[PDB]
């Protein structure tokens, strides 16, 4: 007779498009709770903090020291 | 059927309106027929020369319409699509009204 045995259906978080991968405008690039990663160039983020491409291009992960981490998208030039 | 779940009878009957009781309202139904195919015969197409041909058949009320080019010939029908009415305005028939 216990008092536990509970949990929540996993949510499958994290980067969902890595640096150098080609996307299309719309692709959600990152799923995360806080803001582990922040919007960048052509990268708006959503209500739930979900970063998503804003234009067809590639993904770049700029690490900005104590300024956080960024995910940009340099469109195809 | 099965699992003992709920089939997929979860999806709903938006098919609203599908049955009163005396039954089905007896009303006139229309048969397509694109001018594209009256082009088969050249005379005076009348909804019958059609049934007998191989299109429409007993469905009753014929409504020549659609795609294809018209042809210089009289077309008696129970209806015409705005578009074919046109393509026939290129010279032909327009015996609308129809019926006694």
């Amino acid at each position: 007779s216990t008092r536990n045995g509970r949990d929540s259906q996993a949510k499958r978080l994290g980067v969902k498009r890595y640096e150098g991968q080609v996307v299309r405008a719309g692709n959600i690039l990152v799923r995360q709770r806080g803001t582990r990663f922040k919007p960048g160039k052509n990268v708006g983020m959503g209500r739930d903090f979900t970063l998503f491409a804003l234009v067809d291009g590639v993904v770049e992960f700029q690490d900005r020291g104590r300024l956080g981490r960024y995910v940009h998208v340099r469109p195809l030039a | 059927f099965e699992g003992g779940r709920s089939t997929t009878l979860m999806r709903l009957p938006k098919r609203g309106m599908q049955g009163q009781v005396p039954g089905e309202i007896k009303r006139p139904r229309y048969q397509g027929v694109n001018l594209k195919d009256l082009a088969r015969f050249e005379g005076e197409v009348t909804p019958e020369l059609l049934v007998r041909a191989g299109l429409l058949k007993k469905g009753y009320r014929l409504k020549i319409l659609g795609e294809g080019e018209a042809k210089p010939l009289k077309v008696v029908a129970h209806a015409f699509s705005k578009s074919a009415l046109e393509k026939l305005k290129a010279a032909g028939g327009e015996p609308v009204l129809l019926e006694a």
């Binding site: - | 997929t8 009878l9 979860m10 999806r11 709903l12 009957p13 938006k14 098919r15 599908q18």
Partner: protein, 62 residues
């Protein structure tokens, strides 16, 4: 003898010209109230996949 159609289906689903099986969206019969227009609005018809193959074998004659 002669297969019977599954009235409960024809009453809520449609076979399309392509062969597609289209059923109205589900989820807005009394949920509504605290539902974005996005949700409530997003109730158009939809594909149905892998289950239409089943779902279709019941509209046999129709």
């Amino acid at each position: 003898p002669k297969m019977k159609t599954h009235k409960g289906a024809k009453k809520r689903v449609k076979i399309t010209a392509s062969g597609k099986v289209v059923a109205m969206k589900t989820g807005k019969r009394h949920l509504n109230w605290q539902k974005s227009g996005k949700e409530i609005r997003q109730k158009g018809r939809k594909f149905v996949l892998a289950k239409p193959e089943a779902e279709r074998i019941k509209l046999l004659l129709p």
